[model samples]
Target chain A: STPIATFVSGSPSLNTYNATTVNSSANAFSCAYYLQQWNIQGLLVTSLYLKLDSATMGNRPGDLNSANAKWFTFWVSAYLQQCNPSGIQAGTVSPSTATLTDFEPMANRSVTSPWTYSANGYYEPSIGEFQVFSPVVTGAWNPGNIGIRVLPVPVSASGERYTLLCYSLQCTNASIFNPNNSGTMIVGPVLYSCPAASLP
Target chain B: STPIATFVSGSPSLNTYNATTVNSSANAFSCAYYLQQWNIQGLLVTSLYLKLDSATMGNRPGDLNSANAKWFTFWVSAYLQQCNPSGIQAGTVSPSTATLTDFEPMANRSVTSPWTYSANGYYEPSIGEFQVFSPVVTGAWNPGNIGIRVLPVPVSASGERYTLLCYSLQCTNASIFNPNNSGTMIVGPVLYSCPAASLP
Candidate 1:
C-alpha cells in the first residue's frame, strides 16, 4: 500500500530557519491589498500571523446574507497572483503594489478559515500568534512556476484592518525583505508523492 | 483499513454554526489567565481568536535563549485544568481567577504556534479571526473532561499582554457566556476508529 501523505512544517518552519516579512501591524485591505509571496513549493495548507486592530472587528454572516453590507470574519482567502519574485526583484510589482486583481480568481481559494479542529499540521512553539488554514481547495499551484503569491483578503467592509506578519530572511530591510521570503506563512500541507492507495 | 482518523470540524466551525465568547478587544493575558471551556468530546486539535496589543510583541527565541529578558512571541498553549463546569455554575472559579497552577502543567500543550503553513483543518469562510492549534501533546483530556480550559499565554516580559477572543453560545453575558459553550475553538483533530490498514 502507498504511504499516507506526510506532514511538512513550512515556508516558515518553526524549528527550521528564521525569516521575517514586515508589512505593518496594519496590513489592511480597505477593499485593497498588497500581496506577498513566500519561498515554498507544492500544494500547502498555509497560515498567517494575523492581528486585528482593537476596533469593530467581525461582522455577522447574516448581514452579508441579508444585504450587501460590510461584513467581516476572522477568515481570509488566499490567491495565487499572476506575478512572481521577479515582480519585486525587477521592481515591476511588489507587496506594496499588488492588488486583488493581480492574482487569477480561478487559481485561488476564495475562502480561508480559522476553524482548524483536528487537522494534521505543525506549529511554532510559544512564539507567534496565527490564523491557520487548511487549503481545502487545491489550486493548480506552480501554474506558471512564476512563484506562489499569497494574500490575506479581508472583508472590504469599511474600517477593518487585518494585519499579518511574514518571516523575512532579514527583518530590517525597507526594500528586499526577500520578497520571495518576506510574507506570512503559517505551516504546510506537505508535498508528498501520495501512495496510489491514499491519493485524496 | 481503520478509517485513518476522521477530521472533525470544531468548537467554532464556521460553516456548521455561529457562536461568540466575548472578553474584550483587550483580553490581555498579562502573566495571568482567563480560561474558557468549549463544548466537545474526546481529544481535539483546537484554535483561538487571539490578538496581541500593538506593542512590542514577539520575542526572538534567541532572547529566551539569551539573558533573562522580557520577550514575547505570537503563540499560546492549551491546558486541561482540574476544574469543571461546576466551578462556573457554582460561581466557584471564573476565567478571572484561573491561573497557571489550576491546570496541571503535564496536561497542557505549553507551546502554541502561528507557523501553520499546511495543516489539515477547516475554518470560517469570511468571518472572524483565529489561531489554529494542533495539540501535539494530548493531555489525557477529560483528566476530568470537566471541560477543556484554554489559555493564550503570552510572555510576561514586563508589559506584554495578549488577548484572545472567545465565542459564546449567546454573544452576551457577564458569566454564563454559556460557560460550557462560550470560548474559542478552531477545529478538531478528529476522533476516529482507525482502519486496520491506516492505524497510526
Candidate 2:
C-alpha cells in the first residue's frame, strides 16, 4: 500500500532568490506544477507537501524574533490569469518570468522562523510547512497548474528582507514516498471503496 | 496536520472466532458501525486500519504451508439488505444475530497465515489487511451501516477451519490514529485545497 508519487522541476524547478527590501513585495520567485505533466490531475489528492529551503546565498532572513516572525507567505493555488502566459505558453518557465497575479488561491499561509542559519552549504536545515486542504477533486476535478508562490515581507524598516524556497510536490490518493526528505506528503488512505472514473 | 481520528466498538468490537469445519463456513461472527456514531459523516475518509488477532481458543490453523494458507476472507461493506435489522433495530448489536444474506460489498479480501496458536491471551499478533478505495463520499455519499464481515474457508476436507478477526476503523480527508494498531490508513495528503460539504 505504498506507491507514493511526487513532482519536481519548478522554475529551473521553481527555484529563485531575492536581496529583499523593507516592503512586503509580490512574487519574488515561484514554481508551477501542471496537472498533466505528472499524470496526477485525475487522481484524488489526499495531501500535498511543499519542499522549501531558506538562507540560500542572497536571502537576507527577515522576521527576526516577534517583530515580524512571519518572514514570508507561501501559497498553493491554481495557476491562472495575470501570470506571464509566455512562461506556460513558451514552455520551460523560469523564476525570472514566473511573476503572477489574479490567480485562484488554494492554500495561502505564512510561518515564523528567524531562518537563523539557512543553507549552511549542506542544506543542514531547509524550510517547509504543512497545511491541510480539501481540494474538491473528483471525476470532474482538475485545477490546471498548481502554483507554489512565495511572498517575502520586509523588515520593520526599509532594506530588510526574508527568504522562502520550494523544492518538490508530494501527494496521496483515496482511491489510489521519500524523496528530497519530504517524500510523498500523504494524508488519508482510502479503505475499501470504489471511486467513480475521473475525467480529464 | 495531525488531528487524526478513529472509531472503535464492533460486535463486542467486531471480535469473534470458530473451532473449525472441514468445509468452508459463513459468518462465525461480525460487527457493524453506524456513520453517525463518530461525528465523521462529513469528513473525507483516508485509510482504515483494521485491528485483528491471529490465534484464539478453539481454532485450528489452516493453509499449512501454501496448501491452504488463505485461512479466511474478510470484507468491508455497507450494512444493507439481508442483514438482521434487529441488531440495528435493537440497542446494541452482538455477533449472535449479526448475520447477513445480501449486502453491498465494499472491501473483500483474504490473507495468508496459519493462525499459529492464536488467542494465547495478550493479543501478540492481530489480524488485518489494507485495500485502497475511492469512495464516492461526496454530498451524495452515504452507504448506511458500514459492515465488517468474516468468512472462514475450510481446509481441503470436511471439517478443517481457519479464523480472521477485526478491530477498529480509521480514515483521512480527500480531501480531509494509533489506537488498536491500525490507525487512519492515510494515503495521498492534500498539499492545500478546499473540499465541498457532504450530507447523510
Question: How do all models score by TM-score?
Answer: 0.23, 0.25
TM-scores of the first chain across all predictions? Answer: 0.18, 0.24
TM-score of chain B of 1: 0.18
lDDT of each: 0.21, 0.22
Model 1 CAPRI quality: incorrect
Off by over 4 Å in 2: A1-75, A78-200, B1-9, B12-42, B46-75, B82-198
Per residue, candidate 1 scores C-alpha lDDT tens digits across B33-72 of 2223221111112223322121112121222222222112
Tens digits of lDDT, candidate 2, B87-128: 222222222332221112211112223333221111111222
Q: Interface RMSD of the predictions, in order shown? A: 12.1, 15.0
Q: How accurate locally is residue B60 in candidate 1, as Cα lDDT from 0 to 100? A: 16
| Candidate achieving the largest DockQ | 1
Fnat of each candidate: 0.09, 0.00
